[PDB]
Protein backbone atom coordinates (compact mmCIF):
# COMPACT_ATOMS: atom_id res chain seq x y z
CA UNK A 1 0.00 0.00 0.00
CA UNK A 2 2.78 2.41 0.97
CA UNK A 3 5.79 2.91 -1.29
CA UNK A 4 8.97 3.52 0.70
CA UNK A 5 12.26 4.87 -0.64
CA UNK A 6 15.68 5.22 0.97
CA UNK A 7 17.19 8.48 -0.27
CA UNK A 8 20.55 8.67 1.51
CA UNK A 9 22.62 6.96 4.21
CA UNK A 10 25.48 8.91 5.79
CA UNK A 11 28.13 8.06 8.37
CA UNK A 12 28.61 10.70 11.08
CA UNK A 13 31.04 10.84 13.98
CA UNK A 14 31.59 12.31 17.40
CA UNK A 15 34.86 12.32 19.31
CA UNK A 16 35.25 11.00 22.85
CA UNK A 17 38.19 10.47 25.19
CA UNK A 18 39.06 7.11 23.63
CA UNK A 19 38.64 8.16 20.01
CA UNK A 20 35.84 8.51 17.47
CA UNK A 21 32.39 6.96 17.79
CA UNK A 22 30.72 6.40 14.42
CA UNK A 23 27.00 6.18 13.74
CA UNK A 24 24.70 6.23 10.73
CA UNK A 25 21.78 8.35 9.59
CA UNK A 26 19.05 7.38 7.14
CA UNK A 27 16.74 9.66 5.18
CA UNK A 28 13.60 8.01 3.79
CA UNK A 29 10.28 8.96 2.26
CA UNK A 30 6.97 7.10 2.24
CA UNK A 31 3.85 7.73 0.21
CA UNK A 32 0.60 6.21 -0.99
CA UNK A 33 1.06 7.31 -4.60
CA UNK A 34 -2.18 9.29 -4.36
CA UNK A 35 -1.23 12.62 -2.78
CA UNK A 36 0.17 11.56 0.61
CA UNK A 37 3.88 11.81 1.40
CA UNK A 38 6.10 11.97 4.46
CA UNK A 39 9.80 11.94 5.24
CA UNK A 40 11.67 10.31 8.09
CA UNK A 41 15.19 10.77 9.43
CA UNK A 42 16.71 8.16 11.72
CA UNK A 43 19.98 7.75 13.59
CA UNK A 44 21.48 4.54 14.93
CA UNK A 45 24.77 2.75 15.48
CA UNK A 46 23.77 0.39 12.65
CA UNK A 47 22.44 1.13 9.17
CA UNK A 48 19.39 -1.22 9.29
CA UNK A 49 18.32 0.18 12.66
CA UNK A 50 18.71 3.73 11.34
CA UNK A 51 16.62 2.86 8.27
CA UNK A 52 13.91 1.25 10.41
CA UNK A 53 13.72 4.32 12.65
CA UNK A 54 13.49 6.56 9.58
CA UNK A 55 10.64 4.50 8.10
CA UNK A 56 8.82 4.59 11.44
CA UNK A 57 9.03 8.38 11.59
CA UNK A 58 8.08 8.79 7.93
CA UNK A 59 4.91 6.74 8.34
CA UNK A 60 3.85 9.13 11.12
CA UNK A 61 4.86 12.44 9.46
CA UNK A 62 2.67 12.28 6.33
CA UNK A 63 1.01 15.34 4.78
CA UNK A 64 -1.60 15.82 2.06
CA UNK A 65 -1.07 17.14 -1.47
CA UNK A 66 -3.85 18.16 -3.86
CA UNK A 67 -2.79 16.57 -7.14
CA UNK A 68 -4.35 17.11 -10.58
CA UNK A 69 -4.35 13.80 -12.49
CA UNK A 70 -0.78 12.92 -11.57
CA UNK A 71 0.62 16.44 -11.97
CA UNK A 72 0.89 19.69 -10.04
CA UNK A 73 -1.85 22.32 -9.99
CA UNK A 74 0.53 25.20 -10.77
CA UNK A 75 4.23 26.11 -10.64
CA UNK A 76 5.52 26.10 -7.07
CA UNK A 77 8.64 27.26 -5.25
CA UNK A 78 9.89 25.71 -2.02
CA UNK A 79 12.66 26.72 0.37
CA UNK A 80 14.41 25.20 3.39
CA UNK A 81 17.81 26.33 4.72
CA UNK A 82 20.11 26.66 1.70
CA UNK A 83 17.86 24.67 -0.61
CA UNK A 84 15.49 26.26 -3.10
CA UNK A 85 13.38 24.15 -5.44
CA UNK A 86 11.08 24.91 -8.35
CA UNK A 87 8.48 22.55 -9.79
CA UNK A 88 5.93 22.87 -12.57
CA UNK A 89 3.28 20.61 -14.12
CA UNK A 90 4.01 18.78 -17.35
CA UNK A 91 2.02 17.04 -20.05
CA UNK A 92 1.29 13.32 -19.85
CA UNK A 93 4.25 11.17 -20.84
CA UNK A 94 6.83 13.77 -19.83
CA UNK A 95 7.85 11.80 -16.74
CA UNK A 96 9.56 13.06 -13.61
CA UNK A 97 12.33 15.40 -14.79
CA UNK A 98 13.97 16.03 -11.42
CA UNK A 99 17.06 15.24 -9.38
CA UNK A 100 17.23 12.17 -7.19
CA UNK A 101 16.12 13.65 -3.87
CA UNK A 102 13.17 15.48 -5.42
CA UNK A 103 12.40 12.43 -7.58
CA UNK A 104 11.93 10.10 -4.60
CA UNK A 105 9.48 12.51 -2.93
CA UNK A 106 7.52 13.17 -6.12
CA UNK A 107 7.30 9.49 -7.02
CA UNK A 108 6.09 8.26 -3.64
CA UNK A 109 3.61 11.14 -3.57
CA UNK A 110 2.21 10.08 -6.93
CA UNK A 111 3.36 12.85 -9.27
CA UNK A 112 3.86 11.21 -12.66
CA UNK A 113 4.78 14.20 -14.85
CA UNK A 114 6.71 17.21 -13.60
CA UNK A 115 9.59 19.52 -14.49
CA UNK A 116 11.72 20.41 -11.48
CA UNK A 117 14.98 22.15 -10.65
CA UNK A 118 17.01 22.48 -7.45
CA UNK A 119 18.91 25.72 -6.81
CA UNK A 120 21.25 26.52 -3.95
CA UNK A 121 22.37 23.78 -1.61
CA UNK A 122 21.45 20.30 -2.83
CA UNK A 123 21.78 18.72 0.61
CA UNK A 124 19.23 15.86 0.49
CA UNK A 125 17.67 16.50 3.91
CA UNK A 126 16.92 20.15 3.16
CA UNK A 127 15.96 19.41 -0.46
CA UNK A 128 13.37 16.89 0.75
CA UNK A 129 12.06 19.41 3.28
CA UNK A 130 11.79 22.16 0.64
CA UNK A 131 10.10 19.83 -1.86
CA UNK A 132 7.50 18.69 0.66
CA UNK A 133 6.94 22.30 1.73
CA UNK A 134 6.21 23.33 -1.86
CA UNK A 135 3.86 20.40 -2.43
CA UNK A 136 2.01 21.09 0.82
CA UNK A 137 1.63 24.77 -0.07
CA UNK A 138 0.20 23.95 -3.52
CA UNK A 139 -3.39 25.13 -4.04
CA UNK A 140 -6.26 23.57 -5.96
CA UNK A 141 -9.10 25.29 -7.86
CA UNK A 142 -11.57 24.05 -5.25
CA UNK A 143 -9.58 25.68 -2.43
CA UNK A 144 -9.09 28.89 -4.42
CA UNK A 145 -12.81 29.16 -5.19
CA UNK A 146 -13.81 28.38 -1.60
CA UNK A 147 -11.45 30.95 -0.10
CA UNK A 148 -12.44 33.63 -2.62
CA UNK A 149 -16.17 32.96 -2.27
CA UNK A 150 -16.57 32.12 -5.96
CA UNK A 151 -17.37 29.04 -8.01
CA UNK A 152 -14.87 26.74 -9.69
CA UNK A 153 -16.31 27.78 -13.06
CA UNK A 154 -15.75 31.46 -12.26
CA UNK A 155 -12.20 30.62 -11.14
CA UNK A 156 -11.50 28.72 -14.38
CA UNK A 157 -13.91 30.12 -16.95
CA UNK A 158 -13.33 32.48 -19.87
Amino acid sequence: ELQEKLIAVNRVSKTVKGGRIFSFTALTVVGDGNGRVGFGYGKAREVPAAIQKAMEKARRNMINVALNNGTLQHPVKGVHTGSRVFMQPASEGTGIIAGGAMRAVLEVAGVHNVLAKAYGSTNPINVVRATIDGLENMNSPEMVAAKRGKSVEEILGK
Binding site: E92, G93, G95, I96, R103
Partner: protein
Protein backbone atom coordinates in the same frame (compact mmCIF):
# COMPACT_ATOMS: atom_id res chain seq x y z
CA UNK B 1 25.12 -3.14 -37.35
CA UNK B 2 23.38 -6.23 -35.95
CA UNK B 3 23.89 -8.21 -32.76
CA UNK B 4 25.15 -11.65 -33.80
CA UNK B 5 26.07 -13.19 -30.45
CA UNK B 6 24.26 -15.68 -28.23
CA UNK B 7 20.60 -14.80 -27.80
CA UNK B 8 19.74 -16.22 -24.38
CA UNK B 9 22.46 -14.22 -22.61
CA UNK B 10 20.50 -11.05 -23.39
CA UNK B 11 17.33 -12.45 -21.84
CA UNK B 12 19.32 -13.71 -18.85
CA UNK B 13 20.80 -10.25 -18.31
CA UNK B 14 17.38 -8.62 -18.61
CA UNK B 15 15.81 -11.18 -16.25
CA UNK B 16 12.91 -12.06 -18.55
CA UNK B 17 12.09 -13.86 -21.78
CA UNK B 18 12.63 -11.56 -24.76
CA UNK B 19 11.08 -13.99 -27.30
CA UNK B 20 14.47 -14.33 -28.99
CA UNK B 21 13.75 -18.02 -29.65
CA UNK B 22 10.88 -19.47 -31.66
CA UNK B 23 9.15 -20.98 -28.62
CA UNK B 24 9.14 -24.68 -29.50
CA UNK B 25 10.85 -25.30 -26.14
CA UNK B 26 10.93 -23.51 -22.79
CA UNK B 27 13.42 -20.77 -21.96
CA UNK B 28 14.01 -22.42 -18.58
CA UNK B 29 14.71 -25.77 -20.24
CA UNK B 30 17.10 -24.09 -22.69
CA UNK B 31 18.99 -21.82 -20.27
CA UNK B 32 19.31 -20.61 -16.69
CA UNK B 33 16.97 -17.69 -17.34
CA UNK B 34 16.79 -16.76 -13.65
CA UNK B 35 20.60 -16.33 -13.55
CA UNK B 36 22.56 -13.50 -15.14
CA UNK B 37 25.33 -14.63 -17.52
CA UNK B 38 28.97 -14.97 -16.58
CA UNK B 39 31.11 -16.19 -13.72
CA UNK B 40 29.58 -13.68 -11.29
CA UNK B 41 26.03 -14.22 -12.57
CA UNK B 42 24.80 -15.71 -9.29
CA UNK B 43 25.49 -12.45 -7.43
CA UNK B 44 22.56 -10.26 -6.43
CA UNK B 45 22.78 -7.08 -8.55
CA UNK B 46 22.09 -3.94 -6.57
CA UNK B 47 20.99 -1.53 -9.31
CA UNK B 48 21.04 2.24 -9.01
CA UNK B 49 18.26 4.33 -10.54
CA UNK B 50 20.42 4.93 -13.60
CA UNK B 51 20.97 1.19 -13.79
CA UNK B 52 17.23 0.52 -13.71
CA UNK B 53 16.58 3.08 -16.45
CA UNK B 54 19.42 1.69 -18.56
CA UNK B 55 18.26 -1.91 -18.17
CA UNK B 56 14.71 -1.01 -19.21
CA UNK B 57 15.98 0.78 -22.31
CA UNK B 58 18.31 -2.11 -23.18
CA UNK B 59 15.44 -4.58 -22.73
CA UNK B 60 13.26 -2.72 -25.23
CA UNK B 61 16.20 -2.41 -27.65
CA UNK B 62 16.98 -6.13 -27.41
CA UNK B 63 13.32 -7.05 -27.90
CA UNK B 64 13.00 -5.06 -31.10
CA UNK B 65 16.54 -5.61 -32.45
CA UNK B 66 17.38 -1.90 -32.76
CA UNK B 67 20.82 -0.38 -32.25
CA UNK B 68 21.50 2.74 -30.20
CA UNK B 69 21.69 5.40 -32.93
CA UNK B 70 18.43 4.23 -34.51
CA UNK B 71 16.76 3.96 -31.10
CA UNK B 72 17.82 7.49 -30.14
CA UNK B 73 16.40 8.70 -33.45
CA UNK B 74 13.16 6.88 -32.61
CA UNK B 75 13.05 8.68 -29.26
CA UNK B 76 13.64 12.04 -30.92
CA UNK B 77 10.80 11.36 -33.34
CA UNK B 78 8.53 10.23 -30.49
CA UNK B 79 9.24 13.42 -28.54
CA UNK B 80 8.61 15.51 -31.65
CA UNK B 81 5.30 13.78 -32.42
CA UNK B 82 2.25 15.06 -30.56
CA UNK B 83 1.03 13.16 -27.52
CA UNK B 84 2.58 10.81 -25.00
CA UNK B 85 6.26 10.33 -25.86
CA UNK B 86 6.62 6.82 -24.44
CA UNK B 87 3.52 5.56 -26.23
CA UNK B 88 4.71 7.23 -29.45
CA UNK B 89 8.05 5.43 -29.10
CA UNK B 90 6.32 2.09 -28.60
CA UNK B 91 4.06 2.72 -31.61
CA UNK B 92 7.07 3.62 -33.77
CA UNK B 93 8.81 0.41 -32.73
CA UNK B 94 5.69 -1.65 -33.46
CA UNK B 95 5.37 -0.02 -36.89
CA UNK B 96 8.63 -1.57 -38.10
CA UNK B 97 8.26 -3.92 -41.05
CA UNK B 98 10.21 -6.80 -39.50
CA UNK B 99 8.15 -6.56 -36.31
CA UNK B 100 4.92 -6.39 -38.32
CA UNK B 101 5.95 -9.51 -40.25
CA UNK B 102 6.81 -11.34 -37.02
CA UNK B 103 3.48 -10.38 -35.44
CA UNK B 104 1.66 -11.49 -38.60
CA UNK B 105 3.43 -14.81 -38.10
CA UNK B 106 5.55 -15.19 -41.23
CA UNK B 107 8.68 -15.32 -39.05
CA UNK B 108 9.23 -17.49 -36.00
CA UNK B 109 11.35 -14.74 -34.43
CA UNK B 110 11.98 -11.08 -35.18
CA UNK B 111 15.43 -12.03 -36.49
CA UNK B 112 13.86 -14.53 -38.90
CA UNK B 113 11.29 -11.96 -40.02
CA UNK B 114 14.15 -9.50 -40.56
CA UNK B 115 16.02 -12.05 -42.68
CA UNK B 116 12.85 -12.67 -44.71
CA UNK B 117 12.46 -8.93 -45.27
CA UNK B 118 16.13 -8.48 -46.17
CA UNK B 119 16.22 -11.37 -48.65
CA UNK B 120 13.41 -9.75 -50.70
CA UNK B 121 10.56 -12.08 -49.75
CA UNK B 122 8.10 -9.47 -48.43
CA UNK B 123 5.84 -7.09 -50.34
CA UNK B 124 4.03 -3.98 -49.08
CA UNK B 125 1.03 -2.81 -51.12
CA UNK B 126 2.31 -4.87 -54.05
CA UNK B 127 5.94 -3.67 -54.00
CA UNK B 128 9.04 -5.48 -52.78
CA UNK B 129 10.48 -3.85 -49.65
CA UNK B 130 13.69 -5.17 -48.09
CA UNK B 131 14.23 -2.49 -45.42
CA UNK B 132 13.71 -3.91 -41.94
CA UNK B 133 13.08 -0.43 -40.51
CA UNK B 134 10.38 0.42 -43.07
CA UNK B 135 7.37 1.97 -41.35
CA UNK B 136 4.07 0.23 -42.11
CA UNK B 137 1.12 2.59 -42.52
CA UNK B 138 -2.52 1.80 -41.69
CA UNK B 139 -4.50 -0.05 -44.39
CA UNK B 140 -1.23 -1.42 -45.79
CA UNK B 141 -1.00 -5.02 -47.00
CA UNK B 142 2.05 -7.14 -46.15
CA UNK B 143 2.27 -10.33 -48.20
CA UNK B 144 4.74 -13.15 -48.74
CA UNK B 145 6.35 -13.36 -52.18
CA UNK B 146 5.15 -16.12 -54.48
CA UNK B 147 8.61 -17.68 -54.85
CA UNK B 148 8.92 -17.67 -51.03
CA UNK B 149 5.46 -19.15 -50.36
CA UNK B 150 7.02 -22.62 -50.73
CA UNK B 151 9.48 -22.10 -47.86
CA UNK B 152 8.94 -24.53 -44.99
CA UNK B 153 10.13 -22.04 -42.36
CA UNK B 154 7.20 -19.78 -43.29
CA UNK B 155 4.77 -22.63 -42.59
CA UNK B 156 6.56 -23.41 -39.33
CA UNK B 157 6.30 -19.76 -38.29
CA UNK B 158 2.61 -19.74 -39.23
CA UNK B 159 1.91 -22.82 -37.11
CA UNK B 160 3.86 -21.28 -34.22
CA UNK B 161 2.07 -17.92 -34.45
CA UNK B 162 -1.37 -19.13 -33.35
CA UNK B 163 0.20 -20.68 -30.24
CA UNK B 164 0.57 -17.07 -29.03
CA UNK B 165 -1.93 -14.24 -28.59
CA UNK B 166 -3.37 -12.84 -31.82
CA UNK B 167 -2.64 -9.12 -32.36
CA UNK B 168 -5.97 -7.32 -32.63
CA UNK B 169 -4.62 -4.46 -34.77
CA UNK B 170 -3.69 -6.84 -37.62
CA UNK B 171 -5.81 -9.02 -39.92
CA UNK B 172 -3.86 -12.04 -41.19
CA UNK B 173 -4.86 -14.68 -43.74
CA UNK B 174 -2.41 -17.59 -43.58
CA UNK B 175 -3.88 -19.34 -46.62
CA UNK B 176 -2.81 -16.53 -48.94
CA UNK B 177 0.08 -15.55 -46.61
CA UNK B 178 -0.93 -11.91 -46.39
CA UNK B 179 -2.11 -9.49 -43.74
CA UNK B 180 -3.52 -6.01 -43.34
CA UNK B 181 -2.19 -3.44 -40.85
CA UNK B 182 -5.58 -2.15 -39.76
CA UNK B 183 -4.37 0.47 -37.29
CA UNK B 184 -1.53 1.46 -35.00
CA UNK B 185 -1.59 -0.65 -31.82
CA UNK B 186 -2.67 1.16 -28.68
CA UNK B 187 -0.73 1.14 -25.42
CA UNK B 188 -3.24 -1.36 -24.00
CA UNK B 189 -2.53 -3.85 -26.80
CA UNK B 190 1.17 -3.95 -25.87
CA UNK B 191 2.90 -5.74 -23.01
CA UNK B 192 2.36 -4.32 -19.52
CA UNK B 193 5.88 -5.37 -18.45
CA UNK B 194 7.44 -2.43 -20.32
CA UNK B 195 7.93 0.85 -18.43
CA UNK B 196 8.55 3.38 -21.19
CA UNK B 197 8.63 6.29 -18.75
CA UNK B 198 11.98 4.91 -17.56
CA UNK B 199 13.36 5.25 -21.11
CA UNK B 200 11.87 8.74 -21.41
CA UNK B 201 13.52 9.79 -18.15
CA UNK B 202 16.81 8.15 -19.16
CA UNK B 203 17.00 10.23 -22.32
CA UNK B 204 16.63 13.38 -20.20
CA UNK B 205 19.68 12.65 -18.02
Amino acid sequence: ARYLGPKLKLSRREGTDLFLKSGVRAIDTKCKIEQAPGQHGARKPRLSDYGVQLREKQKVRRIYGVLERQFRNYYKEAARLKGNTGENLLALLEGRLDNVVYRMGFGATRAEARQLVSHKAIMVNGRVVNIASYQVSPNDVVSIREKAKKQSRVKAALELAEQREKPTWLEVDAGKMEGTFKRKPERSDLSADINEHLIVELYSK
